[PDB]
Amino acid sequence: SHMLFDFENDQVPSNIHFLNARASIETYTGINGEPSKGLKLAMQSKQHSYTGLAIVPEQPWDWSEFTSASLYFDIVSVGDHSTQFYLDVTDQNGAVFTRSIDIPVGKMQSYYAKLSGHDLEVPDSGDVNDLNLASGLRSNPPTWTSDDRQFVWMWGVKNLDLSGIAKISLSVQSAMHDKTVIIDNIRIQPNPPQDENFLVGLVDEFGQNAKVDYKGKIHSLEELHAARDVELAELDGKPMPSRSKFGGWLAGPKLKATGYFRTEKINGKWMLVDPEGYPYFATGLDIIRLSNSSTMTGYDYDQATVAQRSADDVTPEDSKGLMAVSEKSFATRHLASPTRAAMFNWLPDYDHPLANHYNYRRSAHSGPLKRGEAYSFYSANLERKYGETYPGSYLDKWREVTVDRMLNWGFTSLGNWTDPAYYDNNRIPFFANGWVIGDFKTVSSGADFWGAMPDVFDPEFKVRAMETARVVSEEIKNSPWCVGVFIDNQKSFGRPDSDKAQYGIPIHTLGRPSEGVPTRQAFSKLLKAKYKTIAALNNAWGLKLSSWAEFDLGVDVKALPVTDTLRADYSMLLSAYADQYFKVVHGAVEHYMPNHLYLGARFPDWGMPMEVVKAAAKYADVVSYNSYKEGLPKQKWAFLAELDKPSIIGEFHIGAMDHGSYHPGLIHAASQADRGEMYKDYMQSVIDNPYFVGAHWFQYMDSPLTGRAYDGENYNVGFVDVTDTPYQEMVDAAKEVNAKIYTERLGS
Numbered sequence: 108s109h110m111l112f113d114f115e116n117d118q119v120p121s122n123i124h125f126l127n128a129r130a131s132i133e134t135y136t137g138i139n140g141e142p143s144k145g146l147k148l149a150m151q152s153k154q155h156s157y158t159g160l161a162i163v164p165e166q167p168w169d170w171s172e173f174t175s176a177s178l179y180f181d182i183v184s185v186g187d188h189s190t191q192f193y194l195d196v197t198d199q200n201g202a203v204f205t206r207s208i209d210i211p212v213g214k215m216q217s218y219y220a221k222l223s224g225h226d227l228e229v230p231d232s233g234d235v236n237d238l239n240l241a242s243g244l245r246s247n248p249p250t251w252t253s254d255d256r257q258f259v260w261m262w263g264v265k266n267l268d269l270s271g272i273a274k275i276s277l278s279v280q281s282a283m284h285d286k287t288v289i290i291d292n293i294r295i296q297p298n299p300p301q302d303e304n305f306l307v308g309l310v311d312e313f314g315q316n317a318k319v320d321y322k323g324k325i326h327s328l329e330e331l332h333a334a335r336d337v338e339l340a341e342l343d344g345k346p347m348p349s350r351s352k353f354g355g356w357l358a359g360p361k362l363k364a365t366g367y368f369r370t371e372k373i374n375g376k377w378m379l380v381d382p383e384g385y386p387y388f389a390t391g392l393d394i395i396r397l398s399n400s401s402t403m404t405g406y407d408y409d410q411a412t413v414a415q416r417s418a419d420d421v422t423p424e425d426s427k428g429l430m431a432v433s434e435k436s437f438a439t440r441h442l443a444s445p446t447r448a449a450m451f452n453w454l455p456d457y458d459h460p461l462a463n464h465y466n467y468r469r470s471a472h473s474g475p476l477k478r479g480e481a482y483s484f485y486s487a488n489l490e491r492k493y494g495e496t497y498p499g500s501y502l503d504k505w506r507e508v509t510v511d512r513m514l515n516w517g518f519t520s521l522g523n524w525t526d527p528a529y530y531d532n533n534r535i536p537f538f539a540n541g542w543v544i545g546d547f548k549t550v551s552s553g554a555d556f557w558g559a560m561p562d563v564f565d566p567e568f569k570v571r572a573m574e575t576a577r578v579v580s581e582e583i584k585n586s587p588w589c590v591g592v593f594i595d596n597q598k599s600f601g602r603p604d605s606d607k608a609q610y611g612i613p614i615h616t617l618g619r620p621s622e623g624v625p626t627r628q629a630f631s632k633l634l635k636a637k638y639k640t641i642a643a644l645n646n647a648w649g650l651k652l653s654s655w656a657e658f659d660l661g662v663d664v665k666a667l668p669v670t671d672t673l674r675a676d677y678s679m680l681l682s683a684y685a686d687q688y689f690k691v692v693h694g695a696v697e698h699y700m701p702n703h704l705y706l707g708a709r710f711p712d713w714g715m716p717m718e719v720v721k722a723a724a725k726y727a728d729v730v731s732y733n734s735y736k737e738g739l740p741k742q743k744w745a746f747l748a749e750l751d752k753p754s755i756i757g758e759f760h761i762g763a764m765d766h767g768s769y770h771p772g773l774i775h776a777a778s779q780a781d782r783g784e785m786y787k788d789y790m791q792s793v794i795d796n797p798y799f800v801g802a803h804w805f806q807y808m809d810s811p812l813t814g815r816a817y818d819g820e821n822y823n824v825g826f827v828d829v830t831d832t833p834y835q836e837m838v839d840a841a842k843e844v845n846a847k848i849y850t851e852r853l854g855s
């Protein structure tokens with residue numbers, strides 16, 4: 108054991124730094140039962156979107172002797188709210204890792220983050236874009252048993268330079284309430300011996316955490332039917348009152364009815380308006396489909412037996428149907444990864460009734476396999492639950508139960524990425540989506556973790572966009588039940604870290620020649636029109652270029668310091684790029700679906716530069732944002748006033764680890780009950796915000812315990828678990844919320 112901070116000297120140490128937080132020392136009751144001194148941390152996290160502490164020693168700590176060690180903290184929350192801490196650990200080289208956990212109120216516990224050894228020793232597949240551990244899980248189960256709680260892996264470098272640890276930071280970010288905790292006994296402990304079965308036998312035959320019994324866990328087929336039967340008894344298909352046919356408000360004003368979902372401002376607040384003229388507000392869940400419900404098993408087939416992707420396809424591999432596997436494929440089954448295969452206590456044989464829930468993926472964003480067999484436990488359970496009278500009948504059953512669930516829960520919509528077989532449900536509105544993919548030219552932003560950005564000035568981008576919109580139009584059949592269309596998702600436009608980050612598309616593209624790069628030519632044209640002469644450009648940018656043609660050879664603007672004049676041109680360049688994306692996209696959607704709302708490209712918190720946002724404001728009927736935070740702080744969202752566009756949250760969630768999962772997700776609660784409470788706080792901030800016309804939750808079901816095929820997300824982010832059994836705390840929170848969306852929003 109190596110003690111760093113026990114606070115028994117009664118000082119707030121001068122090498123801890125606090126931001127929008129108050130520190131003091133207090134007596135409290137320690138884990139062991141004795142009164143100890145502790146650091147009480149009162150974060151002003153309601154008023155400020157970033158709060159916490161950072162310990163920064165005089166000199167970086169040298170911990171290089173600790174080749175198998177964890178950093179421990181004792182922590183508890185005080186007051187009314189659980190706390191999600193982010194832990195950021197910085198070495199002397201500017202490498203940092205980020206872990207996170209929930210800190211409940213009540214019982215104090217010990218928390219640990221690995222500095223070295225065990226599942227860090229070989230960390231991933233070698234690939235920079237891999238956030239997962241080498242297991243293909245975003246965060247693994249513990250590598251030893253203890254009552255202590257492992258800080259959950261999020262992102263960053265796994266193996267820091269232990270000779271120089273420069274900063275340890277604990278922060279509360281974008282909270283809706285003030286958070287207060289007590290911290291004690293910050294220390295280093297050598298890791299105990301590694302449990303070499305830690306990745307062995309994780310999953311039981313139902314897809315659940317096999318080594319943990321937890322409240323609500325399924326133990327036999329009979330418990331699965333009894334849970335099914337209690338629910339099928341409660342589901343009648345009656346919506347909350349008094350909804351109109353399209354889930355709009357009966358009891359409000361009645362507006363113009365165009366026969367399509369559209370936008371209008373009511374009482375100073377943006378709303379949707381349903382096809383019959385009633386005020387509408389969108390609530391619901393994303394990923395109402397099976398595509399993301401399979402997990403890599405570790406087996407592969409002969410390539411000759413697997414159908415290849417067509418270059419024409421509008422659907423990227425992550426969003427494809429589950430691939431039915433043929434016998435000829437299955438008969439060539441071989442072990443590509445021992446680590447994956449050993450995780451499962453049960454996979455079926457080819458003749459077994461549940462053998463149709465195998466999948467094959469021909470690519471993956473990340474994880475230790477680039478391709479391979481997968482299995483959908485969720486899908487298997489649908490068949491366990493509902494049987495298969497004719498092939499795939501449990502699918503029709505599921506869809507019909509899903510629609511009943513959504514109406515019972517008071518939701519007004521089926522959210523993004525709803526399977527298209529629900530597009531004629533004709534009982535609840537839905538959101539449609541498409542992706543523009545293909546072999547058009549590309550540009551780099553410096554952080555394209557999911558592929559290079561589109562060259563939107565290349566005519567082949569338009570061709571592909573047109574095709575994308577054609578396929579959506581064919582899917583939705585001009586339906587009034589379609590609220591509107593999302594195109595794409597969190598495109599990597601530019602990050603807000605730095606100028607080099609935000610302006611990466613302009614900067615990188617300026618560096619290339621104009622020849623063969625349509626986006627470069629467009630930038631060239633704009634710059635030519637603003638400046639006309641190479642001298643005027645030379646003066647603006649502080650350059651010595653001999654001509655426009657030298658300039659068109661490509662210019663390295665990386666070392667130039669960003670003056671105001673330079674920033675205006677970066678901005679103007681980013682703006683024209685985004686304008687062109689949104690023009691092409693809007694154009695295609697409008698050509699095919701003249702009547703439907705175009706809903707944007709779903710801006711993540713890490714990819715909404717104001718230039719791109721303002722571009723979306725021009726062309727999209729509704730600006731969509733993804734926002735994985737406790738809620739919508741006023742200060743982070745004040746910019747909306749200047750746009751005055753109706754807006755929508757495409758994604759958000761909160762998860763916990765009390766129901767078998769090893770990763771709560773992006774935002775963490777202390778329990779199933781706390782999740783539901785944290786859901787209400789988020790939604791409340793949506794509801795109070797006069798620019799938002801809806802918010803969707805990501806997603807319907809938990810991701811597979813051993814992580815989704817695509818990228819290893821293994822999150823407790825469902826309204827239902829892998830057995831298709833709903834989280835009642837989530838259900839109840841959604842009923843409370845969905846009960847007041849109209850009355851509160853439009854009310855007195």
Ligand SMILES: OC[C@H]1O[C@@H](O)[C@H](O)[C@@H](O[C@@H]2O[C@H]3CO[C@@H]([C@@H]2O)[C@@H]3O)[C@H]1O
Pocket residue numbers: 197201202203
């Ligand atoms: O001028 C701002 C910079 O000052 C540098 O001296 C400092 O190293 C750098 O800090 C870092 O910021 C992010 C990029 O790499 C990591 C490092 O801690 C961090 O993730 C920056 O603050």
Ligand SMILES: [Ca+2]
Pocket residue numbers: 113114115143144145291292
């Ligand atoms: Ca103490």
Ligand SMILES: [Ca+2]
Pocket residue numbers: 398399400401425815816817818
């Ligand atoms: Ca997937």
Ligand SMILES: [Ca+2]
Pocket residue numbers: 460461462463490495
């Ligand atoms: Ca079957």
